[PDB]
Amino acid sequence: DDDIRILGTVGLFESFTPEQLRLLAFGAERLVLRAGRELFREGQSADCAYIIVTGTITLFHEGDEGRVTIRPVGPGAILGEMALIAQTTRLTGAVADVETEVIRISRSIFRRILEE
Amino acid sequence: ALDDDIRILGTVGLFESFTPEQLRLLAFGAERLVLRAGRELFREGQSADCAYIIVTGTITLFHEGDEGRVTIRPVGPGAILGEMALIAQTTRLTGAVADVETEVIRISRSIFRRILE
Structure with missing residues (x-):
């Protein structure tokens, strides 16, 4: 149920019905990312x-003298x-x-939800 | 708290790649609104x-139907x-x-634009 709530906060899913959000939660991929995995x-x-359910992801820039x-x-x-x-x-x-649980949503599955 | 605002704004898809400095600018540029129960945005x-980003409270989304709200x-x-606006x-x-009484953060298009410039 919490996944439905989180999906409902997303800008593109703003006007989705509860049914569309369910399809999203079902159609999208639940992933457990292990520590150190580069998304x-x-x-x-x-x-x-990607939508983070639990855990922590670090966003970074790269550089000639190291990762920032x-x-x-x-x-x-x-x-x-926007992908x-x-x-x-x-x-x-x-x-x-850290070990991080995310929901991965493909553009393909998003567009299929639109027709519902 | 400003610190709460920054964290909340940082979860928004459009603001995903913003630096902490950019999120701060956004939090400062934002307008805070307190919505009474029954108020339409x-x-x-x-x-x-x-x-509008909800900080505290609950908002019902609806469609205007033939015989009233749905x-x-x-x-x-x-x-x-x-x-998307x-x-x-x-x-x-x-x-x-x-x-119920609901507190939202309002981000104007103009503020968003200024940050990206």
Whole structure:
């Protein structure tokens, strides 16, 4: 039920019915990211969004003299939302510093929800 | 708290890649509104030039039907209304009314734009 609530906070899902949110929760992929797993990198093409359920992901920029940390994000955070609208570039890098549970939503599944 | 505002704004998809400094600017540029129970934020189909993020309280989203309001679902802390208004020409997709006393953060398109400049 909490996944439904979190999905309902997302901008693109603003006008979704409870049924559409359910389809989303069912159709999207539940992922348990292990500590150290890099979700994506800066400049990489994006076709999915991530929503954090539990855990902490660090957003970072890279650099000639090392990786630069932007900020950590936690439960409720939506990563790569506009990738649901078009193929976007990852604006930052992202790594799960701890075991992190996310919901992954593909653009494909988002668009299928629209027809409901 | 400002610290609470920054954390909340940092969960919003559109503000995802913002630095802590940018989120701070956003939190300062934002307008705080206290909505009494029964207050409507906007009308369905109305032109939209700003987004609202709920801090505390409950808002019912609804569609204006043939014989009155038809409830969609309730939204609470963290929900954003009108996010697309910040980056595109849009109208309010639904109606919205505060069920209880509700505090929201209002982000104008102009504030959002200034930060990206």
